[PDB]
mmCIF file with all atom_site columns, C-alpha atoms in Angstrom:
data_model
loop_
_atom_site.group_PDB
_atom_site.id
_atom_site.type_symbol
_atom_site.label_atom_id
_atom_site.label_alt_id
_atom_site.label_comp_id
_atom_site.label_asym_id
_atom_site.label_entity_id
_atom_site.label_seq_id
_atom_site.pdbx_PDB_ins_code
_atom_site.Cartn_x
_atom_site.Cartn_y
_atom_site.Cartn_z
_atom_site.occupancy
_atom_site.B_iso_or_equiv
_atom_site.pdbx_formal_charge
_atom_site.auth_seq_id
_atom_site.auth_comp_id
_atom_site.auth_asym_id
_atom_site.auth_atom_id
_atom_site.pdbx_PDB_model_num
ATOM 1 C CA . UNK F 1 1 ? 13.764 18.009 -6.382  1.00 0.00 ? 1 UNK F CA 1
ATOM 2 C CA . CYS F 1 2 ? 10.109 16.757 -6.686  1.00 0.00 ? 2 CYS F CA 1
ATOM 3 C CA . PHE F 1 3 ? 8.634  16.663 -10.289 1.00 0.00 ? 3 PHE F CA 1
ATOM 4 C CA . UNK F 1 4 ? 7.067  13.167 -10.999 1.00 0.00 ? 4 UNK F CA 1
ATOM 5 C CA . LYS F 1 5 ? 9.429  10.151 -10.278 1.00 0.00 ? 5 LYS F CA 1
ATOM 6 C CA . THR F 1 6 ? 12.037 12.180 -8.162  1.00 0.00 ? 6 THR F CA 1
ATOM 7 C CA . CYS F 1 7 ? 9.160  12.510 -5.507  1.00 0.00 ? 7 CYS F CA 1
ATOM 8 C CA . UNK F 1 8 ? 8.896  8.612  -5.034  1.00 0.00 ? 8 UNK F CA 1
#
């Protein structure tokens, strides 16, 4: 899931 570029 969300850790740097996987968030947006």
